[model samples]
Structures are given as C-alpha cells and as structure tokens.
Target: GTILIDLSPDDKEFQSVEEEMQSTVREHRDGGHAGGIFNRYNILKIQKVCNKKLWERYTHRRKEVSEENHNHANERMLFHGSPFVNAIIHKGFDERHAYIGGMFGAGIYFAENSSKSNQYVYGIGGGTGCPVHKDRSCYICHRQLLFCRVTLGKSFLQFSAMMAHSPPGHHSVTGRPSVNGLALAEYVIYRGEQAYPEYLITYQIMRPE
Candidate 1:
C-alpha cells in the first residue's frame, strides 16, 4: 500500500495560525496547558462559528441510494471526526469559494495516472457545496476520496487516516469522496469486485444477512 498526503493548506500557514491563535488561547490561569486544553478548545470553537448555513436546499450532491435520494447540498452542516476529513474549506456560490462543486473547478487532478487493474473504490456522496443554480443544479467542490497519499485540495490541514471531515480545503486520501451516475456505475463494475475480494464477481448490490 502507498502513503497519501493531503496538501489542503501549508502548515507554515498553520504555524502562523497557531501563533495567531494565542489571541484566542485562553490562559487557564488556573494552570492550563497552552498546547493542550486551550488550543483544543479554540479549534472546536472556531470550527463551530466558521461554518455555512445556506438559505436553500441544493441538488448537486443528491442520488438514489437504496431508492432514497440523498446528498449534502444546499443549507447543511456536514462534519466528521477524523484526521482524514478535517478540512474546513469555505462554502459560497460565487467565484471566491471555487472548489465546492465541480471536479475540475475544485483542483481535483490525478495524483498519477491510475490503471484499471488497481484496487480503486469510489462512491456517490457530497457533504457541502455552493448552490450555483436557481434549482441548485451545480456547485464547486472538494471531492471526498479514497486513500490517496496526497491532500485533497489547496489547503495544508489535510493528514492521513482522517476520521472526521475537517475544516474547509481539508480532505483525505483515505477519505472516500462520494460519487454519482457514471462515477458510481463504473465503480460498481470495477471497484466493487475488489471491495469484496472473497466473493465471486457478479457485479450487484448485496444486502447483509
């Protein structure tokens, strides 16, 4: 297996942010660890206030899962608790928040050329993005992806084994970004085979016993 790196933003910038966090770093005059409790609280506090709450429900991230339509579009809060998905990229429908909708627009490129023979798994999913259309048909986005050795976007917060959806621009190589239509269909034909290695290749959805 290969290692993945998520370069969502540079840590040098993070160091700067760390330095600045001192302002918010409350001193537990009662004897607290600046590097521990204070920093931890700030991280959580900032995350809560910095999120987006749209006025409408979008449709770009939707799909029929088990005959149910689901996707994280429009006004929503999608977060996970893990290093693999701790990116907090801003969300907007305009040009400023550019990476919340399309694969190409979001800076999602091939880390390297992948072949059909490899064990690649992809699925249809979306956490959040801009409501680009009146009907919210489009968005600029950060793709949730599988284990890649690289960070998912242009931020430095990305890391390995992300269990939570970090702040913006944060994504994981191990984070399996959701998919729809062609992406999912092809994945089913190919990746599904590898996902269930012990079973015969029948290419169909299986319900658990």
Candidate 2:
C-alpha cells in the first residue's frame, strides 16, 4: 500500500549505507565515495522539477523534444546521482506512452552504473562469468540502474545496488551477486519496511524510426 515513511538520518536504511561506507568505500579509493550524495541529489531533482521557474523558461515549447534533446535531458538527470557514461542512454529509446508508473518513471539506480570483473567479461570483454547467481557475478547487471516505477498504492525505487562494488577486477565465473543487495531494484514498502529484492521491472523501448 502507498504509505508515508519517516526515513530520518537515524533510519537503518541510511545506517546500513553508512556501515557500508565504513566497511568498504570506493569513491575514496577508485570507484567513488559513500556519501550517499545521490539521496540528497534525488531530493534536489524533485525540488528542481517543483521549481518550474527554472525549467519553464528553457522548455518553453512545452512539446516533446528532439531525440537528441530527450537523450540529453535524460542523461543530465541520470548524472544527478551517477556519472556513468551509459547514464547517457536514457534518451533515444522510444518509450511507448504506456509507462508503468503514472508519472514516476522506471528511474535509474546504482546497479545500472557499476561493473565487476564478471560483468565486464560477460558483457564487454567476454567471459565465463555465470549469470547473476554466485553473489559476485551480475546479480543485476554490470552497470548500475537508476530507474523507478510506481504502481497503484505501491512504489519501486532503484538505488545504487552494492553488488557492483567488487575486488578490483572482472566478475568470477562462479560467485553470483546475491539478489537482495545485489540486484539494482528495491521496493520501499513504507517508512519502516523496505523490500530489498524480489522485484524486477519490465518495460519495452522502441527505437526511433
């Protein structure tokens, strides 16, 4: 059911994130930091949308933009939380008007941007990395995901899945990233409850004719 949650600084969700930082942070090393900057940036994104004064002047045409324009906007928004080059792919893919969420799109999350040796070999470099099963392989994908989709009385959030963070190298042929923390998609049940895994998003994208 759609419910309001009080995710304060003291919340476990935030605390767990902090724990991860203390345990093994990357941005500070090579991948990135654990500032949860995306969380705050997310709020800013919503704020920017609400602050129509800033965008209305730019999107004055009030019409669907060119493929390039759409792609650029999607990429710009994607970077709000991540700086992955693929975050630039939001545009160009023709989305049917039928969006899963009323207005909340299948937002991108971390799983869509991260990459491990397994994923690196399986996808780009080629490898024996099994499917996302061994708790280290592609539980979701090599890159992090940032998509969000909400349904009636329910909402789905795609945050930076931690599975992507691995020991400097490609994924192993075995080790499968666990689904809960491994998967890029997660469901925010309410203020106190959150479904870490077991949810997957399905959508169709059409290429420009």
Candidate 3:
C-alpha cells in the first residue's frame, strides 16, 4: 500500500540539503574516514527523498518499470529512524544486491552517478554487469536486476534484495571514476518485529579451528 504523508520538495530543497550536508561532511578517499562520509551521506539523502518531489518524478516512471516480485519476501519493514546501517562508498563492483529469497531478506539504500557518458551504465539489480542483462535480470546468465539512471542533485533509492554488478560493458572505457554509495540491510523476523544485526560484521570465528 502506498502511503503519502507530505508534499514533495523542489530541486531547490535538494540543492540546499546537498550543499548543507557536504559542508559538514569530510570526504576520505579510503580508510575509516571514508566510511564516516559514506554513512552520513546515506541518511541525508534518504531523508531528502522522503520530502516528495524527488520520488514523484521517479514513481510515475515506475509504472513503466517491469517488476520481478520476490514471492512476498518483504515484510512491513521500515529502514527509517536515526542510527541505521553504515556502508562504505565504493567506486564500482559494489554488489549490494543479494537475493536469498524467502529464508533471507535484503534491501539497498544508496545513490550513484556515472559522470562519463562512455562509462557504459550504472544501475542496481540482478545482472552480469553486462548489456545482455542490462535492463532486465538475466537469471539464465545468473543475474536479475532493476537498475536505472541517476543524475546529480538527485535523492536516494531504496529497494529490496536482488542480484546485479557494476562491471563496464563492451562500450565502456578504462577508467573515469564511477562514484556510488551502497548500504545493504539483510534480516529476518525476530519474535514479531523485524530485526537487524547491530554489529557491522557478519559471520563468526571458532578460535582458528
């Protein structure tokens, strides 16, 4: 069910927040500092989208988008609220989409931009990071996705789990720096409410066996 609680914000609103957040943030190309910037950017962007205008434009186009439902895998889950997942910003090959179907759950909250026109493409979903599975998920080729183009001064995108890649296509050039931040959340039901991992790290060790 689609719920509307507020009106949309114009580009001016997004512009202001973008600058406001940027001013407060420190960009670290690598290391822990970079992680800080990456995590902060996500909250700022996601909140902005909740403003309205950004999603209005994209939502209209969604009707035209072909969807591949995950057999009712998603619950009445919400990723909002302060202190959410902290993910790193990756240049490319940020495989945030991992579809385990019902037994598991996955979602992504991030933004990306392909400054280079010859950069091939930049999107999310299931694919081999190739053109053959470009628009749609090529399950046969071991891929399934729902990615789209994003531009500057845009808001964030949140989606359920799936498969996808960032590898350039045949027309892509060597390097031009594709910038994107991907924050993925995978979880299962606890008692009755949705539960997520508090710690950033997954898996455990057995004292080196």
Candidate 4:
C-alpha cells in the first residue's frame, strides 16, 4: 500500500530537505556569471512517500548490483519535477512516458539542481476564477517536487545523445554540463525499480518583482 506521511515544519527531516533545496538554488545563483537572481519559492508541505513494495524493489535491485561489483551501490538523492505528482506517487515512475526522443535515450530523467527540475513543474488550480468556480471552491495553487533515491551504479557518462539503454555493463547514464551544453547535471535511469520516491514537496513559486 502507498502512504504519505505529513511532516511538520519543525521536524528535523523537513528542515533538512528545505535547507538542501534552498542552498542548491542559492549556489546556482552564485555560480552563474550573468549575475541574475534565481526564481524563488516557498515550501508549503513535505510528505514522506512510504511504499513498501517500491522500496523493497529498489533496495533489492541496488543490493544485487552492488554485490556483483563488490562495491557501493552509488545511490544518490535527486530531484524530479512533474505535473502528474499524484499519479507518480501511486504508480511510480514509468519509462513508457519518457518518450522516444528524449536527449538521454527515453528514460526517467532526474537532475541534481533544483532550478533545472523546477523548470518542469506546473502549478495546479490557480487560474482566474479558479476557487470561485462552481464545485471548485477549495482549489489551491501549488507545484510538486519529488526527491528520489536513485541507484546510479556504474554510470555511463556521455556528452551527446545516445538513443539506448544503460550500456551493457552500466546501470545508468549521466549527462555532463561541459560537453552536453547543459547548465546542470542530468541523470537517466532506464529501469523503473531503480528509483524510490522518498519525499514529495509541495510549494508555490514566487515570481520576481
């Protein structure tokens, strides 16, 4: 069964995730040479995704890969933003939706930078006359961010597009900024069980004045 546990603002886990997002955004702004401020947002809620079946599958896959290589699983927490937050939380990531023309070979894409992932998020229910519309009075505007634990075991690094799955021995693919013409690092996992959505963050984007 899938479960979402709400975390209080004062909770240590909530604070840690909040800090990670804030620092990532701040560092991105400082790293850019253009000197423009990054778009800001306020976190509204954080919910822990607890899906026993998915977690089991992810851990099992990681362990199997680690044992074969006799090393660490090389797992990392990454960010993924999508409009279908509820669907993802219930059914998990699906490769069929990755589309065949993705730069990274039609796989589940994730990013290390919040700013990059933020570009994909779409806010829901904040349109004009939204809450006032009949039978929709309780609607609110919010976007979702997924912080997932991904098994990047033996990643194959590439600069150009390769319309393929993890190279024979590699478990995942990594796109480098220097050669890929991207401002941030991107990770692609071909298998659905390679990732576990750990936290779901709901927030509102604050536009610059």
Index of the highest-TM-score prediction: 4
The residue-level lDDT of candidate 2 at 93 comes to 14
Ranking by lDDT: 4, 3, 2, 1
Q: What tens digits encode model 1's per-residue C-alpha lDDT throughout 75-176?
A: 211111111222212221222212234232242222221111011111112112112321111212111212111212212222222112323432222222
Off by over 4 Å in 2: 27-209
* Residue 155, candidate 4: C-alpha displacement in angstroms: 0.3
What TM-score would each prediction reach against the true structure? 0.17, 0.19, 0.18, 0.80
lDDT of 2 by residue, 63-119 (tens): 222222332222111111222223222221112211133112322122222222112
* CA lDDT, every model vs. true structure: 0.20, 0.22, 0.23, 0.71
Q: Model 1 segments beyond 4 Å from truth?
A: 1-39, 43-53, 57-91, 99-209
- The full ranking of all candidates by TM-score, starting with the best, is 4, 2, 3, 1
- Tell me how far candidate 4 lies from the true structure as C-alpha RMSD in angstroms: 6.2
The digit string of per-residue lDDT tens for model 3 on 36-65 reads 112223211212112133344433333222
True-structure lDDT of candidate 2: 0.22
CA error at residue 207 for candidate 2, angstroms: 37
- Alpha-carbon runs more than 4 Å astray in model 4: 26-38, 123-140, 160-164, 179-182
Model 4 lDDT tens row, 36-102: 2345667999999999888898898989777755687889999887666688788887775353666
Error of 2 at 111 (Å): 6.1
